[PDB]
Amino acid sequence: AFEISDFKEHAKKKSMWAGALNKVTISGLMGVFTEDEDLMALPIHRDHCPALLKIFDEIIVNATDHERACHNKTKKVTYIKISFDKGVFSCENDGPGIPIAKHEQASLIAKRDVYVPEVASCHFLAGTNINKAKDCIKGGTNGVGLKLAMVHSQWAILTTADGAQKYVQHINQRLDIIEPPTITPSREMFTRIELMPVYQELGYAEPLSETEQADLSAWIYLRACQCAAYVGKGTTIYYNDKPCRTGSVMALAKMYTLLSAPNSTIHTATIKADAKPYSLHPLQVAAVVSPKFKKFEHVSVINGVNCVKGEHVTFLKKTINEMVVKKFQQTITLRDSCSNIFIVIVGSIPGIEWTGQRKDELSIAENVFKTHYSIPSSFLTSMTKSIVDILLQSIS
Amino acid sequence: AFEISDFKEHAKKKSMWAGALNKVTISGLMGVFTEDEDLMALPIHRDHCPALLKIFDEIIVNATDHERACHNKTKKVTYIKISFDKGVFSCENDGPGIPIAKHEQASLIAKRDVYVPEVASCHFLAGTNINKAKDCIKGGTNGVGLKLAMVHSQWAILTTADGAQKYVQHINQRLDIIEPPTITPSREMFTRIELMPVYQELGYAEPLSETEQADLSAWIYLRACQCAAYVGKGTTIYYNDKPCRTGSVMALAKMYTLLSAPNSTIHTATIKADAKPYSLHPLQVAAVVSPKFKKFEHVSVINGVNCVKGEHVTFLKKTINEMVVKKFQQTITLRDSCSNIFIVIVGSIPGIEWTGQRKDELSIAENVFKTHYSIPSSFLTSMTKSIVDILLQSIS
Numbered sequence: 001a002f003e004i005s006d007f008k009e010h011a012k013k014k015s016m017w018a019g020a021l022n023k024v025t026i027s028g029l030m031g032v033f034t035e036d037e038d039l040m041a042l043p044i045h046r047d048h049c050p051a052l053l054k055i056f057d058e059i060i061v062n063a064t065d066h067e068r069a070c071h072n073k074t075k076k077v078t079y080i081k082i083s084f085d086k087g088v089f090s091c092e093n094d095g096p097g098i099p100i101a102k103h104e105q106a107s108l109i110a111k112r113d114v115y116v117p118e119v120a121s122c123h124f125l126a127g128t129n130i131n132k133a134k135d136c137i138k139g140g141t142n143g144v145g146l147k148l149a150m151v152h153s154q155w156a157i158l159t160t161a162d163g164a165q166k167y168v169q170h171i172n173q174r175l176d177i178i179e180p181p182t183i184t185p186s187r188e189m190f191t192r193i194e195l196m197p198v199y200q201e202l203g204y205a206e207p208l209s210e211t212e213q214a215d216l217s218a219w220i221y222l223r224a225c226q227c228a229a230y231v232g233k234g235t236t237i238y239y240n241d242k243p244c245r246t247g248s249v250m251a252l253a254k255m256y257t258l259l260s261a262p263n264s265t266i267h268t269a270t271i272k273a274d275a276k277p278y279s280l281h282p283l284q285v286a287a288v289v290s291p292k293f294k295k296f297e298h299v300s301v302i303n304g305v306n307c308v309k310g311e312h313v314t315f316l317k318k319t320i321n322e323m324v325v326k327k328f329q330q331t332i333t334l335r336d337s338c339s340n341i342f343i344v345i346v347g348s349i350p351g352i353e354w355t356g357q358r359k360d361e362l363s364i365a366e367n368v369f370k371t372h373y374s375i376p377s378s379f380l381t382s383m384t385k386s387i388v389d390i391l392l393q394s395i396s
Numbered sequence: 397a398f399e400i401s402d403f404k405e406h407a408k409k410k411s412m413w414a415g416a417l418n419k420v421t422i423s424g425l426m427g428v429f430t431e432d433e434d435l436m437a438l439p440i441h442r443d444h445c446p447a448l449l450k451i452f453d454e455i456i457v458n459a460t461d462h463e464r465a466c467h468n469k470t471k472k473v474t475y476i477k478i479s480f481d482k483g484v485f486s487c488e489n490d491g492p493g494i495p496i497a498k499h500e501q502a503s504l505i506a507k508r509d510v511y512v513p514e515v516a517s518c519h520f521l522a523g524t525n526i527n528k529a530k531d532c533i534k535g536g537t538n539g540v541g542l543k544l545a546m547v548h549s550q551w552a553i554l555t556t557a558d559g560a561q562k563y564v565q566h567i568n569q570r571l572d573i574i575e576p577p578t579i580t581p582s583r584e585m586f587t588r589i590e591l592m593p594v595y596q597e598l599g600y601a602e603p604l605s606e607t608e609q610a611d612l613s614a615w616i617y618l619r620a621c622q623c624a625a626y627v628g629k630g631t632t633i634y635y636n637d638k639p640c641r642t643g644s645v646m647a648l649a650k651m652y653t654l655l656s657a658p659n660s661t662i663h664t665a666t667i668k669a670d671a672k673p674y675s676l677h678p679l680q681v682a683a684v685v686s687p688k689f690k691k692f693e694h695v696s697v698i699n700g701v702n703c704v705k706g707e708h709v710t711f712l713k714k715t716i717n718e719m720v721v722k723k724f725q726q727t728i729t730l731r732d733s734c735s736n737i738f739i740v741i742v743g744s745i746p747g748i749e750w751t752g753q754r755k756d757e758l759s760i761a762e763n764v765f766k767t768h769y770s771i772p773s774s775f776l777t778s779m780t781k782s783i784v785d786i787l788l789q790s791i792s
């Protein structure tokens with residue numbers, strides 16, 4: 001009755017690692033769909049497997065982490081190329097590869113030669129963020145993300161090149177089969193992850209049905225677009241070799257409001273702080289205010305992660321509400337004030353935590369914002385004007 | 397740069413296991429405070445450490461799981477006794493103890509004698525729920541909760557008795573020191589966990605400040621009260637030897653609305669399903685509708701867990717909204733409809749998953765509810781009456 005699991009078997013069975021391991025209703029699930037030349041972010045009203053979307057997310061975030069790590073180095077990440085076709089998922093970045101070197105600790109443990117990329121891909125609780133600096137703005141921390149991808153893959157190929165050498169390793173059958181790597185001379189420099197998920201075990205058809213394929217493609221496309229607003233100005237994001245043309249919070253904002261409120265006004269702000277480390281990390285905001293928005297809604301990309309809850313949002317909500325209360329009273333709750341707002345927040349916040357491995361919710365003291373950050377008054381004033389206009393109509 | 401962690405060190409560093417490992421703002425944090433003979437559930441507007449509250453929760457849920465496991469057995473759980481004093485936390489339940497027996501697998505691994513309760517308390521990814529039945533309604537699943545308690549304890553004592561024997565083991569210094577157990581003859585039968593958290597490392601004063609102590613006590617008290625509404629009718633919950641007098645969703649409802657809306661009307665429902673396993677697990681609901689409630693709010697206790705998000709809520713929201721739309725239109729969005737509702741939902745739901753180890757959000761297909769459950773019409777009608785009254789006032 002009292003059983004002992006290993007990581008591998010536990011990760012295949014337990015929702016704690018990446019969420020539900022079958023299809024469920026995911027609140028606010030969205031994808032990108034192409035209408036003509038327009039990108040449109042649209043709700044996907046079908047159940048999907050959270051753990052499946054997470055494995056994609058884990059590799060995408062590994063790539064955006066490498067971009068942040070290299071942005072102030074000589075050798076940079078210039079591209080992240082994400083592909084999805086015939087059920088196969090791939091993510092490729094340039095910049096320095098994963099070190100092609102024996103890992104001593106790992107080699108002693110396994111009583112054989114294990115190289116760093118094998119530890120990166122097959123060893124649980126392992127990576128370069130195990131001792132994360134209080135100021136680190138990478139999403140990486142747990143040393144788990146890539147191994148979960150592997151464990152939810154029927155086959156996987158890791159390829160990395162360090163400018164001197166190339167390293168190819170096959171990991172198959174949910175991490176049960178770790179093939180010895182193939183190492184050859186090379187002057188290329190990149191890292192590619194390629195895999196086929198265990199769709200059947202995760203509640204999908206094999207191969208994917210038409211709707212499953214279209215939903216997943218739309219979802220991944222939108223994550224790529226979110227990634228492209230986050231990443232530094234020297235990096236291009238591709239989805240199936242097409243550049244993602246959403247390098248700004250404005251572009252995201254329009255894409256999410258194209259159907260609901262086209263030809264609308266976009267309030268913008270860069271939210272800054274005076275003290276390091278916060279002062280290194282401005283937050284870009286775009287917001288739309290429309291009477292045909294039903295409730296408050298936000299899209300957050302923080303430290304490369306598409307989280308759905310955090311005090312960063314609350315900070316904007318309350319600040320806006322305070323002003324909207326005043327200006328309304330003069331002219332004539334936190335929900336009344338904000339139910340017509342759709343807002344996009346993109347940037348880095350150092351020293352945050354999370355509520356789980358999935359990073360759906362960031363964890364922080366509200367007072368970080370009160371103490372350190374100010375929202376430009378022009379943005380507050382603009383938003384208050386538009387909100388109050390709408391409040392004066394319904395009354396009238 | 398590429399480090400390998402063990403569970404122990406990882407759990408002390410990483411928010412994925414139990415949430416933030418320092419004080420942060422916790423949305424909707426509440427405690428129970430005594431005003432005269434009245435219990436009052438009140439907001440705690442100070443930052444607290446989520447991981448700290450979780451370790452309490454993990455042991456409390458282990459006890460409520462044992463109550464569910466034994467409720468249809470001959471030897472039952474008749475009490476759960478929760479204590480908090482001088483910083484020391486304890487939880488004691490009767491009913492069958494944890495087996496006082498050598499664990500063979502664990503003994504081979506450690507190359508010595510390890511008994512089951514040591515595996516229960518010190519071995520990660522281990523327990524009786526590793527292979528959880530599709531119909532299991534226990535919160536337990538990960539085989540991690542008790543080990544996290546231990547890892548966040550400067551000292552801990554596990555005591556269990558199986559009617560023939562008693563077993564006492566000390567686990568100290570964040571699970572670094574596992575003392576050999578003391579086994580003696582006994583005819584008692586129970587399990588007690590007693591521990592002192594590492595408050596300093598989690599961002600509290602040592603000892604606790606006045607406000608820290610009062611906040612934590614209020615929080616634990618309220619979790620005990622939540623536990624008492626959940627547990628079977630043969631079980632009494634105690635907090636510091638005082639019975640928690642909240643054995644019904646009505647009592648919870650009043651306790652949460654005593655300050656905001658005393659002497660108010662409580663709409664009640666038992667939500668049932670025709671098909672097993674759902675039909676075994678009725679959901680008890682109490683709701684209050686008041687104009688001086690600012691937004692929609694719920695309190696959920698599901699499978700013994702105080703989760704803050706799930707489709708169970710959404711099911712009630714939408715069903716209520718549909719009716720409120722109709723009845724309003726006749727007389728003359730999902731937010732308008734529901735912003736005056738405060739609702740309590742308590743019961744078991746089989747075969748759910750979660751978004752993380754913390755179990756803040758349950759994961760399920762919305763269609764489970766549409767397919768299997770019906771909300772009694774009298775309750776829907778009552779709620780619609782009260783909601784529409786309030787909608788006709790603001791207009792007027």
Ligand SMILES: Nc1ncnc2c1ncn2[C@@H]1O[C@H](COP(=O)(O)OP(=O)(O)O)[C@@H](O)[C@H]1O
Nearest residue numbers: 062066120127128129140141142143144145146
């Ligand atoms: N695309 C990549 N480029 C460079 N290094 C990578 C890449 N993907 C993964 N890594 C390395 O592999 C380690 C293990 O990855 P993962 O298990 O996802 O852990 P983490 O929590 O650090 O993201 C990372 O910490 C990083 O050092």
Ligand SMILES: Nc1ncnc2c1ncn2[C@@H]1O[C@H](COP(=O)(O)OP(=O)(O)O)[C@@H](O)[C@H]1O
Nearest residue numbers: 458462516523524525536537538539540541542
């Ligand atoms: N109070 C208790 N009474 C009986 N058994 C218990 C109790 N607390 C813990 N256990 C046992 O110890 C195991 C390990 O506990 P834990 O690590 O919390 O795992 P789980 O995820 O199963 O709750 C449980 O699965 C259960 O079998």
